[PDB]
């Protein structure tokens, strides 16, 4: 059914692979990892962050308004 | 004849010898790790644990 | 009814598989005495005799 | 033959100056391929053990 | 008063992640509880055998339990009878039932103190601020007689008379029994009473942290190996045109 | 010849975990699904070792739990990993549902519906388990939420007398809640088997949302060791949450004995219910609040019919990504508001939060989908 | 064996774990007892010349809690 | 519509981000019966190009990488290869549905 052997139909594609026993598991870890982390967060930060920024704003304003409301009126 | 070749050959190459290596290393790691973590814990809590003040009350 | 394995080839297979099965039995015995903390063998060993 | 896996298989030893390729080569249909690899490797391990 | 003062953070000896309790302070706090706090408060879930190996030795806790009468029974003739205590006995209740405790304490019920730093927001900080925060009531508010003003009690009206002052008891090890020292010792003992497993938990956590810091890069390395067969893979395309 | 493909018991394991084709590009989020299964086993195992000492009686339930902590060997360890494993179970469950929403995994409608059945079952199981230790918060939370479940006219009062087994929460309720709390994880395990069975007819989804049949890899050894690494990371988080902060997520008011005449100043459920609680009290009508809680949890079931884009994942939809993260932010605000008392300004914030939650799920996301469809010159 | 790899293994197994173990062990040993009683023998704490830096009686790496002065300890 | 809508279309094409995986627009369409039939009706050259682009995108999203900026699919050079086939399949399905109505 959904086993290997009849999943799709691919023609004219060549793939090259190495052994895991003769290539490094951490090939240029920091020197190529830090720029891709900055690239990924630069691609996603303007979609993710400002809702949580306004969450922090509402949280602080609600705490301040609650402590003001418990405070009496001289 | 080099040391990593013989360490692979007589310890890592056979799977039963691999498991014997893992079991003996597990026993020695238990003893050494228990000693090290106990020593770290008694040094961080120097004079606070009961065994540090057990001698005062015989 | 186990008369199918009476020949030189199965004896050859047997003497091939003596050391591997013996080493697996050694692994099983060491793992059993390691997991159970059995006091018969663990008193015969130098470094592990520290908590007794 | 019993499992109707292969169309053909063939072992080889190929030698050049202090190097060479030692192994097997088979042609079969798609649905058999994985099984035969297992069987082929098992045969090698039998010769190893 | 609806607004409530919060207790501050005191720099306890066991405040840190790997710092255990001070067992000498547990011993002194148990002496404080036995001499002072056991008259009105109960610790039904703690026994005399729990003190062995923590702050008292075997014969010490045996004598300290033997100096307590425990109502054993029923007898062969069919009655209750007083007996000297033993190590398997729990701490004795001050009252046989909560309503007698209410009758002896102006209606208010003194709570059981086995979990009282696990049942309050602040814990031992709250207990220290309650015991050391007694003061005369401010103006405007005029509370009822037999109540006491405590800004840390929620509602600021406690039915407990202040039990702590300088030299309310003695210390066998030679410690100045001040107000703050006695309150600190009894707060340490109450933290031990709520969590008798605290030091063993922190030791097991230290072993957990070291073992996980060993195990995580190795398992990550195994993942990077068995996936680095795929992450260096290159694909090509051969269109026939 | 081989037992992996011909033996009828090993054939199932090979078809589900060994030679199963999986997408080659799925991120760490997919590991959460296997983590959920592991949490289930952990809970079940730890639950069994709580059941060897727990006594379901109102006189001796709190005392039995204290005896587990103080006298049973390592019993404090088992109790606190059961509690924090329930919390970790709900964390992994929430991230599993968020993965389902973001990457368009609700188009597997049968898998999605067996999922929301599983979610209902685990919420009820955690509810009755929290009633079980019989503290102040257990008794009062059970009384509050079951009494508001009684709000249906002519039907709800007989149902609440039948659920309680008496006039209010008593020993019959505690014992039947123990029986239900024990037996519900096995229906949960069987439903997870059906969940996986309904998944495996079509295969997993990938973050791009495309047909991954052009590039698929076996589950072994790749996702085997990936899920092992996820299990190790989860056990780091769980054992840090037990051995260092055992009651940071807990509530201290559950450590007093259940006094039926001691109403606490605040009454809350656990944190993983709290958002629905803040949708509960956002409407000043009891039928409206209970039915709105039902819609707030069944809008996940309504979700596969609210999909309008010709794409599937949100990876190439930035506006709907923004609306999704506003929805997650709103859910966080709802959790904080449900933690808070019913005063100013929490009532208006909770009302606007629930209104925006239902508006974002129901209205704004199909509008954003059709806007992006028109924006990509296909509609 | 004509290889750098045995020295790489010997660094990463014997050398660096050994120095880490003795560093942690010295952190276990990092407890110093209280100062000795100031007894002024004439064969030490000598001053045949005032010192060439600063006060003339303080050494280069002087520490006021363990190192005495010929007048005595200082607080 | 003249000045910035085309500019906003270019900016949205850059912002959506399937161009930096080398994908075209019609590669990103989620399959239905209509899309699967339209893919089945494609000729061999466009089918093979589509499947290579899809598995290249899956390779790139495995390693959390993107193509170099010169290999990003250009907005003007993006061809809508599938949508006549998809429109024909949608039209004949609508014909079948309106016949089944009456
Ligand atoms: C830090 C400095 C180094 C750095 O930035 O490296 C860049 C590097 C990213 O560069 P990259 O080239 O994209 O490498 C990622 C690989 O493509 C693919 O590698 P990967 O990141 O997909 O690895 C698999 C993934 C698998 O993660 C999981 O399965 C996690 C699942 C459980 C999550 C938590 C559950 C509970 C949540 C409660 C809230 O692991 C992780 O996400 C982190 C594993 C950390 C293991 C311990 C390392 C010490 O960072 C990492 O790999 C992150 C891990 C280190 C931090
Ligand atoms: C969790 C981490 C380990 C996961 C399994 C694993 O990698 O096993 C190692 C390997 C497989 O990992 P592997 O894929 O690296 O294979 C190693 C290859 N040889 C054997 C040639 C070196 O499995 C075993 O060795 C068998 C399992 C038993 C290991 C020994 C147990 C001894 C103690 C018994 C009590
Ligand atoms: C001219 C002669 C030349 C040759 C002379 C040969 C002999 C010289 C003397 C050798 C040392 C003699 C004493 C050693 C034993 C001390 C025992 C003792 O006090 O133990 C309790 C003390 C205190 O006990 P502890 O409990 O604080 O120790 C911590 C224990 N663990 C590690 C489990 C946490 O322990 C030690 O002193 C242990 C010392 C360990 C380190 C030893 C050296 C390690 C290797 C260093 C070189 C690495 C190169 C790469
Ligand atoms: C916080 C982490 C945010 C984050 O990492 O966001 C980025 C990622 C989206 O990335 P993606 O578009 O897949 O592109 C891959 C390369 N960037 O974002 C994701 O992958 C996030 C996908 C969703 C998973 C998080 C779910 C959060 C909880 C949802 C709760 C609500 C669920 C329904 C409840 C009812
Ligand atoms: C035209 C925009 C141009 C932006 C240029 C930025 C600088 C570009 C040059 C530097 C590169 C920076 C990194 C680039 C990231 C990807 C591209 C980008 O900038 O995208 C902009 C991003 C997504 O773009 P798009 O979806 O078109 O925006 C619609 C706006 N809603 O959109 C955004 O970032 C805007 C997100 C706004 C979100 C506002 C949410 C407000 C409401 C939150 C409510 C939360 C709940 C509150 C409680 C409710 C109940 C009381
Ligand atoms: C008899 C005079 C008592 C003495 C001796 C001690 N306590 Fe007490 N305590 C008593 C009463 C009647 C009450 C109830 C107060 C009320 O108004 O309801 C209490 C209460 C406490 C509490 C709980 C406070 C809370 O906010 O819940 C604590 C933590 C407490 N008491 C501590 C405590 C300690 C440590 C004592 C020994 C020094 C002690 N109390 C003695 C009555 C009496
Ligand atoms: C009881 C808790 C649950 C368990 C044990 C569970 C188990 C699993 C498992 C093992 C998988 C396969 C691994 C994976 O892809 O992550 C999976 C996938 C999935 N589950 Fe669950 N699940 C649970 C809750 C839910 C819920 C509540 C939903 C519905 C919101 C859901 C919907 C899905 C979907 C849609 C997938 C497909 C993943 C994809 O292809 O994208 N699950 N689940
Ligand atoms: C068949 C498996 C299970 C059994 C036998 C079981 C049994 C128990 C028992 C006896 C208790 C009371 C003991 C105590 O409170 O420490 C308990 C508590 C609890 N259980 Fe379970 N449980 C099981 C599965 C689960 C699952 C799957 C969840 C998560 C949904 C869960 C969540 C809880 C919670 C939250 C508590 C309260 C913890 C607390 O005291 O704060 N249980 N369970």
UniProtKB/TrEMBL annotation, chain H:
What topology does the record note for this protein and the membrane? Peripheral membrane protein
Q: Tell me the domain of life.
A: Eukaryota
Naming one, the record's GO cellular component terms include: respiratory chain complex III
Gene Ontology MF, one = protein-containing complex binding
Please provide the record's keywords in A-Z order: Electron transport, Membrane, Mitochondrion, Mitochondrion inner membrane, Respiratory chain, Transport
Protein localization: Mitochondrion inner membrane
Write down what this protein is called: Cytochrome b-c1 complex subunit 7
What is the species listed in this Swiss-Prot or TrEMBL entry? Answer: Mus musculus (Mouse)
């Amino acid at each position: 059914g959904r086993e290997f052997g009849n999943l799709a139909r691919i023609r004219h594609v060549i793939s090259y692979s190495l052994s895991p026993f003769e290539q490094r598991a951490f090939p240029s870890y920091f020197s190529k990892g830090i720029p891709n982390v900055l690239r990924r967060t630069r691609e996603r930060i303007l979609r993710v962050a400002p809702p949580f920024v306004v969450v922090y704003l509402i949280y602080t304003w609600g705490n301040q308004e609650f402590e003001q409301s418990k405070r009496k009126n001289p | 004849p080099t040391i990593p070749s013989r360490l692979y050959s007589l310890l890592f190459r056979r799977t039963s010898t691999f498991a014997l290596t893992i079991a003996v290393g597990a026993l020695f790691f238990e003893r050494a790790f228990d000693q090290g973590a106990d020593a770290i814990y008694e040094h961080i809590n120097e004079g606070k644990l009961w065994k540090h003040i057990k001698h005062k009350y015989e | 009814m186990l008369s199918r394995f009476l020949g030189p080839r199965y004896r050859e297979l047997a003497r091939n598989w003596i050391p591997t099965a013996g080493m697996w039995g050694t692994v099983g015995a060491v793992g059993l005495v390691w997991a159970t903390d059995w006091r018969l063998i663990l008193d015969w060993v130098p470094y592990i005799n520290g908590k007794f | 033959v019993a499992n109707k896996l292969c169309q053909s298989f063939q072992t080889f030893n190929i030698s050049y100056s202090d190097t060479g390729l030692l192994g097997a080569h088979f042609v079969c249909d798609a649905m058999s391929i994985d099984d035969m690899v297992f069987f082929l490797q098992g045969q090698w391990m039998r010769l190893c053990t | 008063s609806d607004l409530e003062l919060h207790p501050p953070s005191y720099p306890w000896s066991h405040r840190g992640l790997l710092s255990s309790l001070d067992h000498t302070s547990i011993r002194r706090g148990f002496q404080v509880y036995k001499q002072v706090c056991s008259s009105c408060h109960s610790m039904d879930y703690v026994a005399y055998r729990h003190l062995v190996g923590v702050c008292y030795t075997e014969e010490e806790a045996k004598a300290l339990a033997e100096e307590v009468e425990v109502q054993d029974g029923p007898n062969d003739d069919g009655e209750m009878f007083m007996r000297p205590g033993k190590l398997s006995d729990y701490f004795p209740k001050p009252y046989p039932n909560p309503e007698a405790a209410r009758a002896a304490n102006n209606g208010a019920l003194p709570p059981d103190l086995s979990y009282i730093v696990r049942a309050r927001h602040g814990g031992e900080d709250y207990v220290f601020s309650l015991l050391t925060g007694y003061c005369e009531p401010p103006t405007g508010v005029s509370l009822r007689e037999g109540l006491y003003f405590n800004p840390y009690f929620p509602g600021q009206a406690i039915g407990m008379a202040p039990p702590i002052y300088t030299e309310v008891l003695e210390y066998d090890d030679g410690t100045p029994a001040t107000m703050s020292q006695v309150a600190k010792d009894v707060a340490t003992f109450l933290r031990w009473a709520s969590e008798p497993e605290h030091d063993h938990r922190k030791r097991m956590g230290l072993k957990m942290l070291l073992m996980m810091g060993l195990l995580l890069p190795l398992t990550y390395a195994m993942k990077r190996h068995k996936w680095s067969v795929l992450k260096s893979r290159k694909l090509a395309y051969r269109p026939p045109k | 010849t081989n037992m992996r493909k011909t033996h009828p018991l090993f054939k199932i394991i090979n078809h589900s975990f060994i030679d199963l084709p999986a997408p080659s590009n799925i991120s760490s989020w997919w590991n959460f699904g296997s983590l959920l299964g592991v949490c289930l086993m952990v809970q079940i195992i730890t639950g069994l070792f709580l059941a060897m000492h727990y006594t379901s009686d109102t006189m001796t339930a709190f005392s039995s739990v204290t005896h587990i902590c103080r006298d049973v060997n390592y019993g404090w360890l088992i109790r606190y990993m059961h509690a924090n494993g329930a919390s970790m179970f709900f964390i992994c469950l929430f991230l599993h549902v968020g993965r389902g929403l973001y990457y368009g995994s609700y188009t597997f409608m049968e898998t999605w519906n067996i999922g929301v059945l599983l979610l209902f079952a685990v919420m009820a199981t955690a509810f009755m388990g929290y009633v079980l230790p019989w503290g102040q918060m257990s008794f009062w939370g059970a009384t509050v939420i079951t009494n508001l479940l009684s709000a249906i006219p002519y039907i709800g009062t007989t149902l609440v007398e039948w659920i309680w087994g008496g006039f209010s929460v008593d020993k019959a309720t505690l014992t039947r809640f123990f029986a239900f709390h024990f037996i519900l994880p096995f229906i949960i395990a069987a439903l997870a088997i059906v969940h996986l069975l309904f998944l495996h007819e079509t295969g997993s989804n990938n973050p791009t949302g495309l047909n991954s049949d052009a590039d698929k890899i076996p589950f072994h050894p790749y996702y085997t060791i990936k899920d092992i690494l996820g299990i190790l990371i989860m056990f780091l988080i769980l054992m840090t949450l037990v051995l260092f902060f055992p009651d940071m997520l807990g509530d201290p008011d559950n450590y007093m004995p259940a006094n039926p005449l001691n109403t606490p100043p605040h009454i809350k459920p656990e944190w993983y219910f709290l958002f629905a609680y803040a949708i509960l009290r956002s409407i000043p009508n009891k039928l409206g609040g209970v039915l709105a809680l039902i819609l707030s949890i069944l809008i996940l079931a309504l979700m596969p019919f609210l999909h309008t884009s010709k794409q599937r994942s949100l990876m190439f939809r930035p506006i709907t990504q923004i609306l999704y993260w506003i929805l997650v932010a709103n859910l966080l605000i709802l959790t904080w508001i449900g933690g808070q008392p019913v005063e100013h300004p929490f009532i208006i914030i909770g009302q606007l939060a629930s209104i925006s939650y239902f508006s974002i799920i129901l209205i704004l996301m199909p509008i954003s989908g059709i806007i992006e469809d028109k924006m990509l010159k296909l509609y | 064996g004509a290889g750098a790899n045995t020295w790489r293994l010997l660094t990463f197994v014997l050398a660096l774990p050994g120095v880490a173990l003795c560093s942690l062990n010295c952190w276990m040993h990092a407890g110093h007892h209280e100062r000795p009683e100031f007894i002024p023998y004439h064969h030490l704490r000598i001053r045949t010349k005032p010192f060439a830096w600063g006060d003339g009686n303080h050494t280069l790496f002087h520490n006021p809690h363990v190192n005495p002065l010929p007048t005595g300890y200082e607080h | 519509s003249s000045k910035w809508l085309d500019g906003f279309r270019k900016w949205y094409y850059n912002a959506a981000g399937f161009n930096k995986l080398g994908l075209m627009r019609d590669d990103t369409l989620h399959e239905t019966e209509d899309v699967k039939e339209a893919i089945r009706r494609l000729p061999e050259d466009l089918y093979n190009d589509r499947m290579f682009r899809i598995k290249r995108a899956l390779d790139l999203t495995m390693r959390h990488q993107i193509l170099p900026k010169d290999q990003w699919t250009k907005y003007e050079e993006d061809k809508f290869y599938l949508e006549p086939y998809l429109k024909e399949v949608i039209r004949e399905r609508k014909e079948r549905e309106e016949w089944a109505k009456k």
